[PDB]
Amino acid sequence: NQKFFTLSNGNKIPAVAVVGTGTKWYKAEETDATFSQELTDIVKLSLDTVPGIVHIDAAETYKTYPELGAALKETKKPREEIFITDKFSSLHKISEDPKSALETALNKLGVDYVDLYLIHSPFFDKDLNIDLETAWKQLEELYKSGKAKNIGVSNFTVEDLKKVLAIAEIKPQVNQIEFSPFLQNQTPGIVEFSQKNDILLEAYSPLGPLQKKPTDADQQPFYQYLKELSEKYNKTEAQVLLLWVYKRGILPVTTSAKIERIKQAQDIFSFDLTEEEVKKITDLGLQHEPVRLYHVDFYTKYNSEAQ
């Protein structure tokens, strides 16, 4: 039942990521006191009970490698039935460079490789002693050594991708961006450019519209239609939006702490949307004001082009 995207290198990636590792409260330090039993328990439960290949989206910045590592050790879910995406913290330095970050992560996770490694932001912390070019080249070496089965970037503009393409031996395989019906181009032209250049887009915060659901939702065309589709298919509104992202050729990344929502996200491929329905979600979304939840200070200037 599970669907996959095929990356430019021929490798497959599960077409929805359903396990996220954010502490609901930002985690400032890594101590026994800050270890989140609640997070480790939901990751373990997901690995135990979610059918098929379970795609986890992790990140150095979360400081939840210990919780992911404990869950990975305690599950009997086999390693090959897990796809682990990890991200080098470029915005806020924790490691000197990608090589150091991933070496540390592999040891904390208790694993030999990650399935996808991303540069989390093109906007490097002033405290980092490495530039974008040098970081990408480190990802190329982690790809060649097999520590990262696939490599890519996150929150890159067209100009950022062009900077990588100018020095790349290995073309980035993924660009994880914020994408939803209320933000259909995180930065100008990114969707069209990425898809034309065989760089797979992942969409984080694809459920932004449901987070920022206004209290007049019952009277808003977008939310009215989303409810109509939910009722038509006997699926949740979340499931309809996640499937819409997939139908736009983009891999939705979601991060619920409710096991039934995690299972529902994995199960989006239990139905389909017609061409009309995909187009109508798109069109009603584009009529809406942009909603941007991440990289706000960097990309506000692009809001006028996002829809």
How would you describe this protein?
The protein is an alpha/beta fold and 307 residues long. The chain is 40% helix and 13% strand. It has 13 helices and ten strands. An eight-stranded parallel β-sheet has the order 3-4-5-6-7-8-9-10. Strands 1-2 form a two-stranded antiparallel sheet. α4 (132-145) links the parallel β6 (116-119) and β7. The longest helix has 14 residues, at 132-145. The protein is globular, with a radius of gyration of 19 Å. The two termini are 33 Å apart. It is classed as oxidoreductase. Keywords: apo-form, NADPH-dependent, beta-8/alpha-8-barrel. The assembly is monomeric.
Keyword list:
TIM Barrel; monomer; 13% strand; alpha/beta; NADPH-dependent; oxidoreductase; beta-8/alpha-8-barrel; 8-stranded parallel beta sheet; two-stranded antiparallel ribbon
List the helices and strands and how they pair.
Layout: E1 4-6, E2 12-14, E3 19-20, H1 37-49, E4 54-57, H2 65-74, E5 82-88, H3 98-109, E6 116-119, H4 132-145, E7 151-154, H5 158-167, E8 174-178, H6 190-196, E9 200-204, H7 208-211, H8 221-233, H9 237-247, E10 251-253, H10 259-266, H11 275-287, H12 296-299, H13 303-306
Parallel strand pairs: 3-4, 4-5, 5-6, 6-7, 7-8, 8-9, 9-10
Antiparallel strand pairs: 1-2
Helix pairs in contact: 1-2, 8-9, 8-11
